[PDB]
Design a protein around this ligand. Sequence first.
Ligand SMILES: Nc1nc2c(ncn2[C@@H]2O[C@H](COP(=O)(O)OP(=O)(O)O)[C@@H](O)[C@H]2O)c(=O)[nH]1
Ligand SMILES: Nc1nc2c(ncn2[C@@H]2O[C@H](COP(=O)(O)OP(=O)(O)O)[C@@H](O)[C@H]2O)c(=O)[nH]1
Lengths: 110, 116, 369, 369
Amino acid sequence: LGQGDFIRHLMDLLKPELVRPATTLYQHNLTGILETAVRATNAQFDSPEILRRLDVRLLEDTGWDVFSLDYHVDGPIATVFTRECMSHYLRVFNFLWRAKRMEYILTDIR
Amino acid sequence: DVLESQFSQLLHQINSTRDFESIRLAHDHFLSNLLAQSFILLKPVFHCLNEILDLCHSFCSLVSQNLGPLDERGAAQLSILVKGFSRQSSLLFKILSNSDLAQLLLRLDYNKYYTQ
Amino acid sequence: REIITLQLGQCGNQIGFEFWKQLCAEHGISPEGIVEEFTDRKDVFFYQYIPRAVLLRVIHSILNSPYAKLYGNNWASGFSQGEKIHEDIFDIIDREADGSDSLEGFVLCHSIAGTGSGLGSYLLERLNDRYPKKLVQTYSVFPVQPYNSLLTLKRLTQNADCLVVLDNTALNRIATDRLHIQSFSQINQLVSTIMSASTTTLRYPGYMNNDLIGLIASLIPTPRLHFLMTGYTPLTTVLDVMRRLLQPKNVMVSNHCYIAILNIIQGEVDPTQVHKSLQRIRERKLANFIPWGPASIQVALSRKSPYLRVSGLMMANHTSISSLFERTCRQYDKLRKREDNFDEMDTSREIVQQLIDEYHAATRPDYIS
Amino acid sequence: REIITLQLGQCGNQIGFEFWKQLCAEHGISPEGIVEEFTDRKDVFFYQYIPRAVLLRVIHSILNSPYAKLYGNNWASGFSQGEKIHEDIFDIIDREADGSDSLEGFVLCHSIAGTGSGLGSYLLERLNDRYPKKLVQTYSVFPVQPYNSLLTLKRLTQNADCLVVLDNTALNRIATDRLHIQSFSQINQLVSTIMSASTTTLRYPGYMNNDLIGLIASLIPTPRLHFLMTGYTPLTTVLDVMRRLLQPKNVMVSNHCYIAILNIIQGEVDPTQVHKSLQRIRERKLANFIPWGPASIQVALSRKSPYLRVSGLMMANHTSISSLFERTCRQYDKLRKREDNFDEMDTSREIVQQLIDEYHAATRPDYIS
Ligand SMILES: Nc1nc2c(ncn2[C@@H]2O[C@H](COP(=O)(O)OP(=O)(O)O)[C@@H](O)[C@H]2O)c(=O)[nH]1
Ligand SMILES: Nc1nc2c(ncn2[C@@H]2O[C@H](COP(=O)(O)OP(=O)(O)O)[C@@H](O)[C@H]2O)c(=O)[nH]1
């Protein structure tokens, strides 16, 4: 979440979707919103290569409990991350996602 | 927008590399994309839309095989397909929910299937 | 599949002549009707070259042009004469039909204001009588004047299987803003650019949209809603185009929502980003649509004439066009209280009112049934 | 999200024009509104580049400037004339709002001392009528002057969603101290630096504060106490900046306690020692805080414009701001006993008395209820 500008727009677009239960959620729909979100923010001016790996994954309730980004990496660069950094980032990304919706709720009440 | 887009890359990879070895690979990858993008290799979607294909043959014939209202067991035959078509319609909807993003967007411009 | 054009009245004959001028110059065909040396499939609008036109004082001006080798005021006054020479003109149509391989449609270019108003009314009925299997598209033009306009509607609402609207008052406003004219010969120039661009995908060989049926069938969902309005941006990415189309300052018209949208791109734009523009455009939710029927926005590419930079035209079927009809009906009701049976006008008054309701009912979540 | 700015009266146009000059030079934007070659998110304040300004004699001197390609004295007189052109100016705003992707707020730059002040009070009410879900932040500037000042205060206390006070008496003293001027174009240099620095975290995105409500939701505790004051350190460690802003000889304002503080450090400072300094400043107890609810101090970093060193900006909510209203209040009563209903002055005089009564009671251990 070090970008901030991109995650702001991404939390405004997933609001109408994640409120529904997880059973009606299918990954094929969220990607469209994700591609639009990059264009709608400053993340469009970015290296096309790294943007090819950034996608969504569905953890396996409510839509605010199974959504998370993945950024899969394979090849030579995969010897620095080694399937454990990707099992640690997602362990972190939840705590930064919760502490981000608990704030945009409290600026909506305000 | 898969032909005029993949083709416009195949022609661009040609006028760029003075090497010929690229052409044998650029053209080869161009061909594999068409089989992959156009869902010809993807069996589930290709075995579901195929049912939609021959489905219209029946319906279009039904309207052309007469000039009066659907009374002589045509209506009895009419309600047969809608129970399958609309079932086949929303059946496809769950399939798309990598490449389908360019397709499902067009059908969902008015969020009509969202109500399905 | 060939399509023949029909030109009536002063307005029709003037714009159609210019419509060909833009068309023949678009190809390598000199004014004397011969190919210049200097791809473009020309079968739809030309015969082997000769254009498939049927024209009906002003003909002197055309015969005096360098293109000599290229071939009352009341509605009652017009309709009366048309019945008298019925068999005279239908010889021309018949001889042009069998001379064509497979006739497909009948483009009609006329103004609803005076002889073209009635004669066109007479034609459309008789055309449907003899030919029931032919599409009938008309390039009608909008402005005792109201009475002539209302009578034409009664025929245009049930006969013409397609239609486009071109209003001068809105067109004249574009003149003083971006062209600074204050002239018919000038405002007609935009019409030619509008008309020629309206049928670009038919002359250049493409994947789809190879017939008039391939274009209109997407827009008109039901035979009652058979009216369109136009839009033209260039007066440079695809997103730059689609944004500038939907602005209300560019369209040629004087709650409400669209039914279907067509986009004509005549430039050489990179076609990889086109699906991206729709994504961003849909998100912006810049335009509203019907909630009952599933539809989308149509976008089609083309190529500009090399013998002549990116342009763009948009075809729209908007329910806001019902507003224009009200003005005619509103004025007529004022005339009916201001002055052999006078019942034909009364029946038409009813049938035009039905169309206003059908549009108004179409913007409802429950238009169907 | 986008933020549309408005400029009213002679002051609003001048400080807004100087705000845009500084904001154009801070970015890579030529005076011809064209991007020069030479990361900074500029979509909020610039439109694809066009500023989202609505300007309202001084306009001519702006149009004769090199930046032309970038686009009585009573309160009742200023209120009525806005009513007669009610529909006029909103068409400019209505097209800019709907032409905008997703509107967020309305920045207002105006001086409450008189046609502009009267026009402002009118527009502040109508924006509450039409748009209920849009913030309205006002960069008001303090100076029959007592009359006009309190009337606009009646609207600024219940209409404007936030407010940043900038009084000339504090700015002029700063110009007669470190500036040594003995002019309007001179003190506006300082006003432009505070305004440009106020929205710094909006244009350079960081982990936090990516929206206008993010800065305001922390300071303003209740919708009534929506007045703020500013502090510029320069007219280097982070521990120096904080101790050079909390000083009362740097605030732009002529017991009491703080409610919330926000610090903007715009330098290239070391971002690892920022958490240390907040550990020490608490120990020296340089500021006294509210006893009823919890309050803290906030520090936010950013990056200076490379195309143009450490600077600071402190936005605070001090109950000592109640004194400024008292001066206008007391000045009003002296004129009321000295000279169609004159009842609006009575209501305005009454409602500001409740605001002052909130502040003096906001410093007690039982402000709850
Ligand atoms: N926009 C446009 N309208 C035209 C032009 N020429 C004629 N018209 C329209 O045609 C109407 C008059 O037609 P009219 O001359 O009576 O047709 P006629 O009776 O067959 O000769 C007017 O209302 C005009 O608006 C033209 O060049 N441009
Ligand atoms: N801070 C600041 N205030 C200004 C500036 N110019 C004018 N003012 C204020 O505006 C007031 C005069 O308003 P005026 O322009 O006569 O109102 P108008 O005639 O209705 O536009 C004075 O009381 C000043 O305090 C400026 O450059 N900076």
